[PDB]
Structures are given as structure tokens and as C-alpha cells.
Design a protein around this ligand. Structure first.
Ligand SMILES: C[C@]12CC[C@H]3[C@@H](CC=C4C[C@@H](OS(N)(=O)=O)CC[C@@]43C)[C@@H]1CC[C@@H]2C=O
Ligand SMILES: [Zn+2]
Length: 257
């Protein structure tokens, strides 16, 4: 029922999910001059060498690549985190044009798109339990700008024609998400939420300062996806981003000076 349109979009979500107006909602604008350098923050540990991708899916709000999270094969640790977070899936948010698409903004700057790698805390045993906990999830956010192609993204772009409409899925084995990472793991971090329903306040956000560059041809392929099911009027899958929410009583911390 919820979506990104005039009648069902982010301004409507609070009616089915009242936590939409809560104290720790995401995304937010990252004010770079107000974010505090925290020399206590550790380097982020990204261990994706044994990642096992399974499927790529159009879920009617994005597309996601899903991983085997039944063992510690692809894990996020350190940075602001206590303990071990398993990679469940990655997905993107993007715009109708290059000047919008990111969920987080930097000094009010919007990027063409934003990549989210979703991880859950192994101390809670499964992701359904983890979303009920204030430290249940860690989402690694990476900005996309349009320029040079990202070679590591091309395998994803080339299969999108096979999952054009909602619920369509395909085999997507042996995909290496290390090919989506920028050089630097310098980050901002703050306590927040899922950015779609159910908007659960379970997320430690880790947003990388360095964007990756993707080509216009790569992002054009995102914009050919459809929100609609096969045979329905349909409706290009574009502008699937929630706008920045009030920071309220929260501090954004920087890992870097
Ligand atoms: C599957 C669930 C509902 C959907 C939840 C998932 C946890 C995290 C994300 C990531 C989020 O996007 S974002 N932008 O916040 O990272 C989109 C929603 C989604 C897929 C839940 C785990 C349990 C729950 C129902 O069984
Ligand atoms: Zn997301």
C-alpha cells in the first residue's frame, strides 16, 4: 500500500507507521561543520571475502541482492559497533535525474543515488529479532555520483532487464560486493532508523564520506525498473528516496578530522 507517490509517499507513512515522527528517524542531513570528530571511533572492519550472494529481487520499492546470512561469511565490525553484524542484502535509492536520489544529504547536497548494505547483530540471532532492538542493525551507506563507470556494479546493471517488475527475481550468485566500495572507509555515524516502513528505530548508520562514481548508462538502467507488477499500468521505479528527517536530540560523529 505504501510507496513514493503523491497519495502513498513518505508524507503519508506516519498513518500506518506512527514511529515515522519518532525521535531517531532516518535519513538526515549531515552538517559537515557540526559533525564532531571522535578520535575514540575505530576503523570500520569490512570482511566480505567469503560473501555468498544468492538472489536479486524487485521488491516493488527497490531491487536487492540477498546474501547467505546463516554464518559469519560477510560481516561488519568495529567502527562505532559492538560485536558482529552479518550482511543480509544491499539495495539502492535513486532519482529521476542526477540531482536527486540519495536519502542522506551532505550540507544539503543530494547525490544521484545511495547504496545501502544492510547488516544485523548476531547477538539477536535473526534479523526479525534484530529490528526490535536499538542496536539490532548496521547499515553502511555509500553515495553515488555520475561520472566514470563503476566496473564492480556492471554485473548488477546487466541483470536488471530480467527483474523489471515487482516480485520478479533471478539467480545472482558469486557477486563480490567489495567491487562497490570506495577507497576510503572514513565515515559519519549516528543512531537512526529504517528509511522504509516499518521505519524501525534499530539502525546504527555508517555513511561513507567518499562517493563512488557510476556512469550515466549504469544509472539509466536503474531508472528503467518499474514499481508496478507485470501487466499493470505501471510507473518507472525512480525517486524511491525518503527525504531528510529532523535530527532532534542526536549527534553525528565523524571518524576523520
Ligand atoms: C524483512 C523485514 C521488513 C523489511 C526490512 C527488513 C529489515 C531491513 C530492511 C532494509 C530497509 O531499507 S533501509 N533503507 O532502511 O536499509 C527496507 C526494509 C527492510 C528490507 C525487516 C527484517 C524483518 C522484517 C519482516 O520480516
Ligand atoms: Zn535503503
Amino acid at each position: 500500500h505504501w510507496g513514493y507517490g503523491k497519495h502513498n509517499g513518505p508524507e503519508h507513512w506516519h498513518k500506518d507507521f506512527p514511529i515515522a515522527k519518532g525521535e531517531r528517524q532516518s535519513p538526515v542531513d549531515i552538517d559537515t561543520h557540526t559533525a564532531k570528530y571522535d578520535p575514540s571511533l575505530k576503523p570500520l572492519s569490512v570482511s566480505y571475502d567469503q560473501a555468498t550472494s544468492l538472489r536479486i529481487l524487485n521488491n516493488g520499492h527497490s531491487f536487492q541482492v540477498t546474501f547467505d546470512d546463516s554464518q559469519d561469511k560477510a560481516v561488519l565490525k568495529g567502527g562505532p559497533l559492538d560485536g558482529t553484524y552479518r550482511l543480509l542484502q544491499f539495495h539502492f535509492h535513486w532519482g529521476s535525474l542526477d540531482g536527486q536520489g540519495s536519502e542522506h544529504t551532505v550540507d544539503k547536497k543530494k547525490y544521484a543515488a545511495e547504496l545501502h548494505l544492510v547488516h544485523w547483530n548476531t547477538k539477536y540471532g535473526d534479523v526479525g529479532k534484530a529490528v526490535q532492538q536499538p542496536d539490532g542493525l548496521a547499515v553502511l551507506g555509500i553515495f553515488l555520483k555520475v561520472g566514470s563507470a563503476k566496473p564492480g556494479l556492471q554485473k548488477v546493471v546487466d541483470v536488471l532487464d530480467s527483474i523489471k517488475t515487482e516480485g520478479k527475481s533471478a539467480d545472482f550468485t558469486n557477486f563480490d560486493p567489495r567491487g562497490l566500495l570506495p577507497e576510503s572507509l572514513d565515515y559519519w555515524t549516528y543512531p537512526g532508523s529504517l528509511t522504509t516502513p516499518p521505519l524501525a528505530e534499530c539502525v546504527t548508520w555508517i555513511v561513507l564520506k567518499e562517493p563512488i562514481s557510476v556512469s550515466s548508462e549504469q544509472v539509466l538502467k536503474f531508472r528503467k525498473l518499474n514499481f508496478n507488477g507485470e501487466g499493470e499500468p505501471e510507473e518507472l521505479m525512480v525517486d524511491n528516496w525518503r527525504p531528510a528527517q529532523p535530527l532532534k536530540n542526536r549527534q553525528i560523529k565523524a571518524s576523520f578530522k
